[PDB]
Amino acid sequence: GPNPSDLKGPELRILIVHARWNLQAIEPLVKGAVETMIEKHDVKLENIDIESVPGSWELPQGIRASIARNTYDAVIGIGVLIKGSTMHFEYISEAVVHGLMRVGLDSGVPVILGLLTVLNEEQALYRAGLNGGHNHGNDWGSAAVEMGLKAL
Amino acid sequence: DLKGPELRILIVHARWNLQAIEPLVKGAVETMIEKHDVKLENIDIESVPGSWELPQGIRASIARNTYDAVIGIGVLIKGSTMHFEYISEAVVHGLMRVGLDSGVPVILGLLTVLNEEQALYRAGLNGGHNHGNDWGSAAVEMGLKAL
Amino acid sequence: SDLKGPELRILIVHARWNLQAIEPLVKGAVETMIEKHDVKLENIDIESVPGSWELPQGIRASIARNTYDAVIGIGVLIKGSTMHFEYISEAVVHGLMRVGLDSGVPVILGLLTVLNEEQALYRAGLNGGHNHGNDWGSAAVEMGLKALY
Amino acid sequence: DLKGPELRILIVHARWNLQAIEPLVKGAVETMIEKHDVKLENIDIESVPGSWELPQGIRASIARNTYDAVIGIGVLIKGSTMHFEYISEAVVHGLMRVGLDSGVPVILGLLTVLNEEQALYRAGLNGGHNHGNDWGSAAVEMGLKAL
Amino acid sequence: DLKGPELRILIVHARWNLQAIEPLVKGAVETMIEKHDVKLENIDIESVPGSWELPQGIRASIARNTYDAVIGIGVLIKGSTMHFEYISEAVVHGLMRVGLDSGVPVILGLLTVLNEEQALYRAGLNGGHNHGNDWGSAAVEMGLKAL
Ligand SMILES: Cc1cc2nc3c(=O)[nH]c(=O)nc-3n(C[C@H](O)[C@H](O)[C@H](O)CO)c2cc1C
Ligand SMILES: Cc1cc2nc3c(=O)[nH]c(=O)nc-3n(C[C@H](O)[C@H](O)[C@H](O)CO)c2cc1C
Ligand SMILES: Cc1cc2nc3c(=O)[nH]c(=O)nc-3n(C[C@H](O)[C@H](O)[C@H](O)CO)c2cc1C
Ligand SMILES: Cc1cc2nc3c(=O)[nH]c(=O)nc-3n(C[C@H](O)[C@H](O)[C@H](O)CO)c2cc1C
Ligand SMILES: Cc1cc2nc3c(=O)[nH]c(=O)nc-3n(C[C@H](O)[C@H](O)[C@H](O)CO)c2cc1C
Incomplete structure (x- = not known):
């Protein structure tokens, strides 16, 4: 599984952009990422936008617009895509993931992937820390801090 | 709660499957006007x-005029060949690229369905929800956040 | 379409694999542009x-040499025993989209990606099918005009 | 008949599955020389x-010298993992990119097969047609059309 | 018989599945030093x-220092969601891009497997061949050919 770090980033500025489809799963993810950065990495609440x-379609664009306006050491893009009856899921999952990798590489700002691509709601909630699962938002918080520091 | 009386919105739509396209365009326009105070004359x-021409039509239009947000609308239905799989992927990638290259928000109004029924259902017919409404709200929201 | 493009310059690049299917497609695109949109024969290269792999590159080379208002890329890819079909279908389609977006010149997709010969011939107007080359001709004129005017 | 006595051709090939690679390189070279009058000393x-290194080796080489056309040759065989699926796609994309970025025609001599037999058959063994010959002609033609 | 005593090589590796990563890194390093005379001090x-952070980590690093070649090592294992499929593709595309953009050879040391056993087997455990050895030799070769 994952192997996070024990780094401190009191001076890091971190941006979190999240979609609003499936808020039930999004909230715990955001909250986990924030709590972990503060309590475990000493990031300051004022430094987290x-x-x-x-x-999810708007995530790469929203992130690109925001890093052009302000300066961030790292960004976390959070969204939940659930397979439906059409091929929508397959095609936008691929476009969004590609989009996020591009924004990070074009700008030089680390973009942490907080996109869940699941078959059903249960899988999403499970990865958000509910029903006995592990909250992946925590890992994302630590990844952002680590990448923020290594970026300089 | 978001109002954009000064927003200029562009809507580019394909002409294959007009039966499903029209309700989507209409739903988007009606929603922007009636619910976000966008002005009818501010919507091109x-x-x-x-659908293949969508990315190119949008690219050409935003080079000529200035818009706060764009909605690309089309309907791709799986057929007997692999056409559907390959162009769906290219068109979606194309739309993301035009939005990122230009800095102008591009809202995805592309239905990629297995059959006609699925498209009509997503255009508000037969008891379904009209996705055009969601796209209009999205365009307004992204347009405002874009500044 | 009631659109006329007597001053349009159109480029058609086609591959040579499966000429049996390619010819009717090219022919249908040309005849439609001329007879239905008043494009001039001498304005069609x-x-x-x-x-098909060469399609994007040939188009890119040609639109750098001359000026065109619209381009039509024509090719026929048929599924074989290897994964060749799947991988290059995707790369070629992506390449044609890229050339159109990089240059600003409308690229009309005239690429058939079929499971067998019959599907391609049928889409070329044979055996009771509709010739897709006609639609491509009309699309190139429309996009050419909207490219500018 | 297309003749290119003044063309400079580059051939970059991987080394995995040399059994299939050699005949492909050989067919491409013999065909350019014997049928298109390309000069032995004009072929690097x-x-x-x-195969992963193909796009990078080609990009590096066309930055150092000037060539009229390039042939990228390699063989990918499906194995137990998903490696085949993912690098086949990335390599093919990489080869298309280098060609478009540079303006130098890149001929695809990448076989993406399910097993060894399929690759040998396409290299001209066991009663099959050597695809290397086709690639040699294609490079000459694209080399001349590139000017 | 390629020797690169003056080569500077960068190795960036993820930390998911360390059980498989360590043998891979070790094989790569050992092979470069013992078989290609690369100096331990010249290996970062x-x-x-x-794995998602590999392309970005590599890009940041080759912008700071100068390397003759890079090896990106990570292990992606198929799970219950479609995560594996989507990011395997984006990471592979990302690594090809960083190499073509920068001009620095990037050796793919990414295993995309269906389960843990497939990964360990490819790391030299349970009778398998350590793929890291192959990657170390590829890096030396591409580093030397890169000039
Ligand atoms: C048919 C359909 C299904 C969608 N499913 C999701 C989903 O599961 N998760 C998500 O974040 N967005 C989803 N979206 C929203 C998409 O990311 C975007 O807002 C819209 O396509 C318009 O840009 C969906 C949109 C459509 C039209
Ligand atoms: C065989 C075939 C099927 C097509 N199916 C669709 C479709 O379902 N929806 C759509 O908007 N366009 C469709 N198109 C049109 C495509 O987006 C484009 O206009 C044309 O390929 C010419 O560039 C199709 C074109 C072809 C040749
Ligand atoms: C195994 C194989 C199958 C091919 N199938 C097609 C096809 O169906 N249509 C086409 O236009 N070209 C096809 N090509 C040619 C390809 O588009 C191209 O010319 C060359 O592969 C690299 O120049 C094929 C080439 C190979 C090696
Ligand atoms: C559901 C899920 C599965 C993941 N699986 C892997 C894996 O198999 N290998 C790996 O290196 N990273 C994996 N990651 C981590 C990913 O590459 C990345 O570090 C994080 O998403 C933060 O951007 C996974 C992350 C998630 C959310
Ligand atoms: C598990 C695995 C399978 C590979 N299979 C092939 C293959 O079928 N053909 C080929 O040219 N290279 C193959 N390669 C090598 C690849 O092209 C490249 O040299 C290395 O991955 C490091 O970039 C493989 C490498 C690995 C690790």
Whole structure:
């Protein structure tokens, strides 16, 4: 499984952009990422910006717009895509993931992937720390801090 | 709660499967006007032959005029060949690229369905929800956040 | 379409694998542009390349040499015993989208990605099918005009 | 008949599955020389460990010297993992990119097969047709059309 | 018989599945030093949380220092969601991009497997061949050919 770090980033500025489809799963993820950065990495509450966009499709664009306006040491993109009856899931999952990798590489700002691509709601909730699962948001918080520091 | 009386929105839609396209365009327009105070004269509506032309039509139009947000609308239905799989992927990638290259929010109004029924259901027919409404709200929201 | 493009310059690049299917497609695109959209025969350049893989590159080279208002890329890819079909279908389609977006010139997709010969011939107007080359011709004129005017 | 006595051709090939690679390189070279009058000293041949390095080895080489066309040759065989699926796609994409970025025609000589037999058959063994010959002609034609 | 006593090599590896990663890194390093005369001081070893961070970690590092070649090592195992499919593809595409953008050879040391056993087997355990050895030799070769 994952192997996080014990790094401190009191001076890091971190941006979190999350979609709003499936808020039930999004909230615990955001909260986990924030709590872990503060309590475990000494990031300051004032240095964490939180923005939202309607859906996962908008994540790469929202992130790109925000890092052009302000300066961040790392960004976490959070969203939940659930397979439905159409091929929508397959095609936008791929476009969004590609989009996030591009924004990070174009800008030089680490973009941490907080995108869940699941078959059903249960899988999402389970990865958000509910029903006995592990909250992946925590890992994302630690990844952001680590990448923020290594980025300089 | 978001109002954009000064927003300029572009809507580019393909012409294959007009039966499903029209309700989507209409739903988007009605929602922006009636619920976000966008002005009818501030909404440009253009069309292209098919979904393949969507990225290019949008790229050309945003180079000519200035818009706060764009909605690309089309309907791709799986057929007997592999056409559907390969162009769906290319068109979706194309739309993301035009949005990122230009800095202009591009809202995805592309239905990629197995059959006609699925598209109509997502256009508000037969008891379904009209996704066009969601796209209009998204365009307004992204347009405002874009500044 | 009631659109006329007597001043449009159109480029058609087609591959040579499966000429049986390629010819009717090219022919249908040309005849439609001329007879239905008043494009002038002398304003239509026709070029060929060995295979679909070369399509994006041939188009990129040609639109850097001359000026065109719209381009139509024509090729036929048929599923074989290897994964060749799946991988290059995807790369070629992506390449044609890229060339159109990089250059600003409308690229009409005239690429058939079929499971067998019959599907391609049918889409070329044979055996009771509709010739897709006609639609491509009309799309190139429309996009050419909207490219500018 | 296309003749290119003044063309400079580059051939970069991987080294995994040499049994299939050699005949492909050989067919491409023999065909350019014997049928298109390309000069032996005008053909550079380079190798890289595997297919993954093909795009990078080609990019490096066309930055150093000037070539009219390039042929990238390699063989990918489906194995037990998903490696085949993911690098086949990335390599093919990488080869298309290098060609478009540079303006130098890149001919695809990458076989993506399910097993060894399929690759040998396409290299001209066991009653099959050597695809290397086709690639040689394609490079000459694209080399001349590139100017 | 390639020797690169003056080569500077960078190795960036993720930390998911350390059980498989360590043997891979070790095989790569040992092979470069014992078989290609690369100096232990000239090998930088960095890590990142997961495979998703590999392309970015590598890009940041080759912007700071100068390396003749890079090896990106990570292990992606198929799970219950579609995560594996989507990020395997994006990471592989990402690594090819960083290598083509920068001009620095990037050796793919990414295992995309269906289960833990497949990964350990490819790391030289349970009778398998250590793929890290192959990657170390590829890096030396591409580093030397890169000039
Ligand atoms: C049919 C359909 C299904 C969608 N499913 C999701 C989903 O599961 N998760 C998500 O974040 N956004 C989803 N979206 C929203 C998408 O990311 C975006 O807001 C819209 O396509 C318009 O840009 C969906 C949109 C559509 C039209
Ligand atoms: C065989 C075939 C099937 C097509 N199916 C669709 C479709 O379902 N929806 C759509 O908007 N366009 C479709 N198109 C049109 C495509 O987006 C484009 O206009 C044309 O390929 C010419 O560039 C299709 C074109 C072809 C050749
Ligand atoms: C195994 C194999 C199958 C091919 N199938 C097609 C096909 O169906 N259509 C086409 O235009 N070209 C095809 N090509 C040619 C390809 O588009 C191209 O010319 C060359 O592969 C690299 O120049 C094929 C090439 C190979 C090696
Ligand atoms: C598990 C595995 C399977 C591979 N299979 C192939 C293959 O079928 N063909 C090929 O040219 N290279 C293959 N390679 C090598 C690849 O092209 C490249 O040299 C290395 O991955 C390091 O970049 C493979 C490498 C690995 C680790
Ligand atoms: C559901 C899930 C599965 C993951 N699986 C892997 C894996 O198999 N290998 C790996 O290196 N990283 C894995 N990661 C981590 C990923 O590469 C990355 O570090 C994090 O998503 C933060 O951007 C996974 C992350 C998630 C959320």
